[PDB]
Design an enzyme around this catalytic site. Sequence first.
Site, PDB file in Angstrom:
ATOM      1  N   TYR A  73     -23.275   4.768  -1.831  1.00  0.00           N
ATOM      2  CA  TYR A  73     -22.410   5.639  -2.614  1.00  0.00           C
ATOM      3  C   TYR A  73     -20.956   5.360  -2.234  1.00  0.00           C
ATOM      4  O   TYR A  73     -20.660   5.071  -1.073  1.00  0.00           O
ATOM      5  CB  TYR A  73     -22.758   7.106  -2.355  1.00  0.00           C
ATOM      6  CG  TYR A  73     -24.116   7.496  -2.893  1.00  0.00           C
ATOM      7  CD1 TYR A  73     -24.358   7.528  -4.266  1.00  0.00           C
ATOM      8  CD2 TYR A  73     -25.163   7.814  -2.031  1.00  0.00           C
ATOM      9  CE1 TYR A  73     -25.612   7.864  -4.771  1.00  0.00           C
ATOM     10  CE2 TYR A  73     -26.424   8.151  -2.529  1.00  0.00           C
ATOM     11  CZ  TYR A  73     -26.640   8.173  -3.897  1.00  0.00           C
ATOM     12  OH  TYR A  73     -27.884   8.488  -4.397  1.00  0.00           O
ATOM     13  N   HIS A 131     -21.556   4.772  -6.473  1.00  0.00           N
ATOM     14  CA  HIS A 131     -21.989   3.671  -7.328  1.00  0.00           C
ATOM     15  C   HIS A 131     -22.011   4.098  -8.786  1.00  0.00           C
ATOM     16  O   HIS A 131     -21.977   5.290  -9.095  1.00  0.00           O
ATOM     17  CB  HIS A 131     -23.329   3.075  -6.881  1.00  0.00           C
ATOM     18  CG  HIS A 131     -24.489   4.004  -7.018  1.00  0.00           C
ATOM     19  ND1 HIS A 131     -24.994   4.385  -8.242  1.00  0.00           N
ATOM     20  CD2 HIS A 131     -25.272   4.595  -6.086  1.00  0.00           C
ATOM     21  CE1 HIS A 131     -26.041   5.168  -8.057  1.00  0.00           C
ATOM     22  NE2 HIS A 131     -26.229   5.312  -6.758  1.00  0.00           N
ATOM     23  N   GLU A 189     -21.171   8.031  -9.390  1.00  0.00           N
ATOM     24  CA  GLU A 189     -21.756   9.222  -8.786  1.00  0.00           C
ATOM     25  C   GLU A 189     -21.511   9.238  -7.283  1.00  0.00           C
ATOM     26  O   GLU A 189     -21.545   8.199  -6.619  1.00  0.00           O
ATOM     27  CB  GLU A 189     -23.249   9.343  -9.108  1.00  0.00           C
ATOM     28  CG  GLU A 189     -24.107   8.172  -8.665  1.00  0.00           C
ATOM     29  CD  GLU A 189     -25.583   8.503  -8.701  1.00  0.00           C
ATOM     30  OE1 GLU A 189     -26.012   9.391  -7.940  1.00  0.00           O
ATOM     31  OE2 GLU A 189     -26.318   7.878  -9.483  1.00  0.00           O
ATOM     32  N   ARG A 209     -24.672  15.800  -7.227  1.00  0.00           N
ATOM     33  CA  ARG A 209     -23.704  14.720  -7.388  1.00  0.00           C
ATOM     34  C   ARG A 209     -22.490  15.124  -8.213  1.00  0.00           C
ATOM     35  O   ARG A 209     -22.589  15.928  -9.145  1.00  0.00           O
ATOM     36  CB  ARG A 209     -24.339  13.530  -8.121  1.00  0.00           C
ATOM     37  CG  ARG A 209     -25.639  13.005  -7.548  1.00  0.00           C
ATOM     38  CD  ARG A 209     -25.425  12.199  -6.280  1.00  0.00           C
ATOM     39  NE  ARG A 209     -26.693  11.668  -5.794  1.00  0.00           N
ATOM     40  CZ  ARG A 209     -27.470  12.280  -4.909  1.00  0.00           C
ATOM     41  NH1 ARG A 209     -27.104  13.448  -4.394  1.00  0.00           N
ATOM     42  NH2 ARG A 209     -28.643  11.754  -4.581  1.00  0.00           N
ATOM     43  N   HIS A 231     -30.591  16.744  -9.132  1.00  0.00           N
ATOM     44  CA  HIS A 231     -31.994  16.370  -9.286  1.00  0.00           C
ATOM     45  C   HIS A 231     -32.836  17.648  -9.249  1.00  0.00           C
ATOM     46  O   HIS A 231     -34.005  17.644  -9.636  1.00  0.00           O
ATOM     47  CB  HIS A 231     -32.450  15.471  -8.132  1.00  0.00           C
ATOM     48  CG  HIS A 231     -31.962  14.059  -8.221  1.00  0.00           C
ATOM     49  ND1 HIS A 231     -32.219  13.251  -9.305  1.00  0.00           N
ATOM     50  CD2 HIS A 231     -31.274  13.299  -7.337  1.00  0.00           C
ATOM     51  CE1 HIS A 231     -31.713  12.051  -9.086  1.00  0.00           C
ATOM     52  NE2 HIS A 231     -31.134  12.054  -7.898  1.00  0.00           N
ATOM     53  N   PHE A 245     -31.793  13.740 -13.733  1.00  0.00           N
ATOM     54  CA  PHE A 245     -30.747  14.700 -13.414  1.00  0.00           C
ATOM     55  C   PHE A 245     -30.640  15.711 -14.536  1.00  0.00           C
ATOM     56  O   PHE A 245     -30.974  15.415 -15.685  1.00  0.00           O
ATOM     57  CB  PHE A 245     -29.379  14.020 -13.348  1.00  0.00           C
ATOM     58  CG  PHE A 245     -29.125  13.241 -12.094  1.00  0.00           C
ATOM     59  CD1 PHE A 245     -28.757  13.891 -10.923  1.00  0.00           C
ATOM     60  CD2 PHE A 245     -29.155  11.852 -12.111  1.00  0.00           C
ATOM     61  CE1 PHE A 245     -28.413  13.165  -9.787  1.00  0.00           C
ATOM     62  CE2 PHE A 245     -28.812  11.118 -10.981  1.00  0.00           C
ATOM     63  CZ  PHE A 245     -28.438  11.776  -9.817  1.00  0.00           C
TER      64      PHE A 245
HETATM   65  N1  LIG Z   1     -31.345   9.285 -13.212  1.00  0.00           N
HETATM   66  C1  LIG Z   1     -30.373   8.383 -13.220  1.00  0.00           C
HETATM   67  N2  LIG Z   1     -30.302   7.471 -12.255  1.00  0.00           N
HETATM   68  C2  LIG Z   1     -29.226   6.663 -12.373  1.00  0.00           C
HETATM   69  C3  LIG Z   1     -28.259   6.689 -13.333  1.00  0.00           C
HETATM   70  N3  LIG Z   1     -27.316   5.702 -13.123  1.00  0.00           N
HETATM   71  C4  LIG Z   1     -27.740   5.094 -12.056  1.00  0.00           C
HETATM   72  N4  LIG Z   1     -28.910   5.611 -11.543  1.00  0.00           N
HETATM   73  C5  LIG Z   1     -29.786   4.986 -10.497  1.00  0.00           C
HETATM   74  O1  LIG Z   1     -30.974   4.427 -11.152  1.00  0.00           O
HETATM   75  C6  LIG Z   1     -32.136   4.557 -10.299  1.00  0.00           C
HETATM   76  C7  LIG Z   1     -33.240   5.434 -10.927  1.00  0.00           C
HETATM   77  O2  LIG Z   1     -32.848   6.790 -11.163  1.00  0.00           O
HETATM   78  C8  LIG Z   1     -31.582   5.189  -9.024  1.00  0.00           C
HETATM   79  O3  LIG Z   1     -31.261   4.069  -8.164  1.00  0.00           O
HETATM   80  C9  LIG Z   1     -30.327   5.953  -9.494  1.00  0.00           C
HETATM   81  O4  LIG Z   1     -29.325   6.074  -8.479  1.00  0.00           O
HETATM   82  P1  LIG Z   1     -29.311   7.290  -7.464  1.00  0.00           P
HETATM   83  O5  LIG Z   1     -30.733   7.420  -7.072  1.00  0.00           O
HETATM   84  O6  LIG Z   1     -28.401   6.814  -6.386  1.00  0.00           O
HETATM   85  O7  LIG Z   1     -28.788   8.404  -8.279  1.00  0.00           O
HETATM   86  C10 LIG Z   1     -28.351   7.642 -14.360  1.00  0.00           C
HETATM   87  O8  LIG Z   1     -27.608   7.708 -15.332  1.00  0.00           O
HETATM   88  N5  LIG Z   1     -29.449   8.468 -14.230  1.00  0.00           N
END
Ligand SMILES: Nc1nc2c(ncn2[C@@H]2O[C@H](CO)[C@@H](O)[C@H]2OP(=O)(O)O)c(=O)[nH]1
EC number: 4.6.1.24
Length: 104
Positions: free
Chosen positions: A38, A40, A58, A77, A92, A100
């Site tokens: 993070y 990212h 995020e 986030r 989450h 999310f």
């Molecule tokens: N749910 C969700 N995950 C995202 C999004 N953009 C990036 N991710 C990443 O995609 C993967 C599946 O959810 C995870 O690695 C998540 O990162 P984080 O887990 O760090 O949030 C988004 O728009 N929604």
Amino acid sequence: ACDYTCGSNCYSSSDVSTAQAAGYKLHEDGETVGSNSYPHKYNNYEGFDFSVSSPYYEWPILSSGDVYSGGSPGADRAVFNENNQLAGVITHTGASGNNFVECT
Ligand SMILES: Nc1nc2c(ncn2[C@@H]2O[C@H](CO)[C@@H](O)[C@H]2OP(=O)(O)O)c(=O)[nH]1
Ligand SMILES: [Ca+2]
Ligand SMILES: [Ca+2]
């Protein structure tokens, strides 16, 4: 009263501003923290109606009031863009798998 409520977590605007400032600074310096790296890019797979332009990033906001530094990111986030504008606060909590939902 809470400016943002993520599940059981109560956040004021100052909580979000403080978290965002730390995340944005790391982003500008091209550095990341934590095993999940993070901050990212946030792709917005959920399709939230963000009122500011992309790209989005995020960054974890912690319920303890402490600024994220690399441990467990938790469920909440702060999402900000390239111009340091807050896009939204998401979590989450109350969502299936790694999806999310927006904080109210
Ligand atoms: N749910 C969700 N995950 C995202 C999004 N953009 C990036 N991710 C990443 O995609 C993967 C599946 O959810 C995870 O690695 C998540 O990162 P984080 O887990 O760090 O949030 C988004 O728009 N929604
Ligand atoms: Ca607080
Ligand atoms: Ca503290």
